[PDB]
Structure formats: structure tokens, C-alpha cells
Amino acid sequence: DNREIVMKYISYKLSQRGYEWDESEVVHQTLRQAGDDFSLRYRRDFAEMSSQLHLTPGTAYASFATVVEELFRDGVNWGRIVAFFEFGGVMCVESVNREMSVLVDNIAAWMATYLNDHLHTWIQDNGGWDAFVELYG
């Protein structure tokens, strides 16, 4: 349940920054492209967010949960789902940047849990990932 989409996304985001880590491919491609477009368009916002983010082992779980709860406070939509994935990427990149790479595995798990428990119903009820591909393809 959703581990693969998260794992392939985070692997890609980290690889884009020079770090090696470790349903169908059109979905993973579309998400990569959407995320990339989003981070390019909002490059300064993302750079400043990366900067200002507070991150340690003891605070990371609460930081992720709080951000993601606020992101979806008003409901789910695809643009917010893309931001979610991109924010998971930011946290993972910063984790590695700040010599806290042990957090990557945890962040990926939190992302998969959140998809499974909190985004799955909206995605299921709004045409699934195929709809995402139709919107962004």
C-alpha cells in the first residue's frame, strides 16, 4: 500500500541532488514531472522553506505531521498532493544535507502511512491516479 510510489519519488528527489538511496510507470513519471515543475516554479519559496525548516531526530516526526495536517486542512486536491510529495522530498534532501540521513527512511514511511490512511479515500473517490495522469499528462 503506497510504499512504491513514495519510494520511487524520494529516490528520484535525492538522486537529483547527487545522493543515492534505494502503480504503473506513467503515474511515477507524471508525478516526477509535476513535482519538478512545481519546485521550479516556486524555486525561491522552496529554497527559503528548506532553509527555515527545523529538523532533528526528535522533532522530525512532529514537523512532518504538522506541515502535512496544515497542507490538507481545507481538503485534498491533486495540487496539494503534489506539494505533499515535494515537501517529503525537501525534508529528505535537507536530512541528508544536514548529516541526518538516517531520517530519510522514516520520512518515506510517514509519507506512505499518510497516503494510505489520509489520502487514499480522496484519491479513490476522484478517479484514482489515472485521473492524475489525465490532469497532468
Partner: peptide, 19 residues
């Protein structure tokens, strides 16, 4: 407290999404 900085990041992110 530390909730507050993270809450504001989340709002920034939501607003970027909705843009």
C-alpha cells in the same frame, strides 16, 4: 510553540499548491 513555525510552513505550502 515549534508547532507554530511548522504550521506556517504548511500554510505557505498550501498557498503555493493553490496558486
Amino acid at each position: 510553540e515549534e508547532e507554530q513555525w511548522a504550521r506556517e510552513i504548511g500554510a505557505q505550502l498550501r498557498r503555493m499548491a493553490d496558486d
